[PDB]
Amino acid sequence: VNVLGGIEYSINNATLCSVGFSVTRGATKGFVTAGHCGGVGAIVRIGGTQVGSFAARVFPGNDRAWVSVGSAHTLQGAVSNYSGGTIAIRGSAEAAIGAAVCRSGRTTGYRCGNITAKNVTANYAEGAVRGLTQGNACMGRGDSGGSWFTSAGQAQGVMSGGNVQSNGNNCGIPASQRSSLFERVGPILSQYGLSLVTS
Ligand SMILES: [Cl-]
Ligand SMILES: [Cl-]
Ligand SMILES: [Cl-]
Ligand SMILES: [Cl-]
Numbered sequence: 362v363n364v365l366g367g368i369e370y371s372i373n374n375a376t377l378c379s380v381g382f383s384v385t386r387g388a389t390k391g392f393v394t395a396g397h398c399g400g401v402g403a404i405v406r407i408g409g410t411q412v413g414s415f416a417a418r419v420f421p422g423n424d425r426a427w428v429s430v431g432s433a434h435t436l437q438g439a440v441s442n443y444s445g446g447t448i449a450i451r452g453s454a455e456a457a458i459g460a461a462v463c464r465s466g467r468t469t470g471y472r473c474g475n476i477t478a479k480n481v482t483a484n485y486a487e488g489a490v491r492g493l494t495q496g497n498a499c500m501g502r503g504d505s506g507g508s509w510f511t512s513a514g515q516a517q518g519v520m521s522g523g524n525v526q527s528n529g530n531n532c533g534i535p536a537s538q539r540s541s542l543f544e545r546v547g548p549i550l551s552q553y554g555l556s557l558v559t560s
Pocket of ligand 4: 548
């Protein structure tokens with residue numbers, strides 16, 4: 362099957378998250394996602410079809426993981442726009458506060474906003490996560506792990522958390538009232554020796 366940013370994957374046939382970005386490591390295929398999405402060795406399906414398992418993760422403290430993917434599957438260096446098309450990923454140049462950014466994930470789809478803060482600590486129940494970047498694109502439960510990227514194709518990070526309301530998302534309040542937090546992609550690629558797939 363095809364591995365594409367923002368699409369749904371299941372963990373141990375029990376929970377759902379969203380693909381961050383296709384990557385390679387040596388001759389191994391994979392994708393980056395959030396560390397809170399599963400433990401090491403947990404089995405990942407895309408389409409109800411098994412593609413691999415969590416190879417490594419850090420959560421809390423950080424919130425990062427990568428999933429290794431079998432050689433028979435096809436990595437696309439792109440992110441789904443949730444309207445039948447894709448946005449090409451071209452690199453991982455980090456954007457500054459005030460820059461436009463979008464995200465993609467299986468609960469709220471493709472949503473856009475701006476970068477609003479850096480170096481934010483989230484106090485999650487399982488522990489604090491430091492160094493997160495904040496934007497004001499909306500998101501909801503299930504978007505976790507999904508792509509954050511600029512329109513020009515620069516990968517920014519993977520969805521970590523934020524100020525979800527009673528409905529499970531923060532799309533029911535204006536952007537000015539949102540905190541949507543992502544883990545920067547650069548340190549994930551560096552820690553695990555991963556190369557971003559581009560197109
Ligand atoms: Cl491939
Ligand atoms: Cl900045
Ligand atoms: Cl929490
Ligand atoms: Cl980064």
